[PDB]
């Protein structure tokens, strides 16, 4: 069995936080990655 296991919890606010972070980094770094 798995005596110590916890499913990861990622609420809606954390979802939007992560999506915003990823998209902001993408818009910031695309101009350099494309170069």
């Amino acid at each position: 069995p798995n005596p110590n296991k916890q499913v990861v919890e990622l609420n809606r606010t954390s979802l939007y936080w992560g999506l915003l972070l990823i998209f902001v980094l993408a818009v910031l770094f695309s101009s350099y990655i494309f170069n």
């Binding site: 499913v7 990861v8 919890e9 990622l10 609420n11 809606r12 979802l15 992560g18 999506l19 990823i22 998209f23 980094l25 993408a26 695309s30 990655i33 494309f34 170069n35």
Partner: peptide, 27 residues
């Protein structure tokens, strides 16, 4: 730039999919 386009697409895809599947696991 094929390399840059592929990298940007991957960076958009994989973390978004990871976060979305995490949300589906527990909302």
């Amino acid at each position: 730039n094929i390399y840059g386009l592929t990298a940007t697409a991957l960076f958009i895809i994989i973390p978004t999919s990871f976060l979305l599947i995490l949300y589906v696991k527990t909302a």
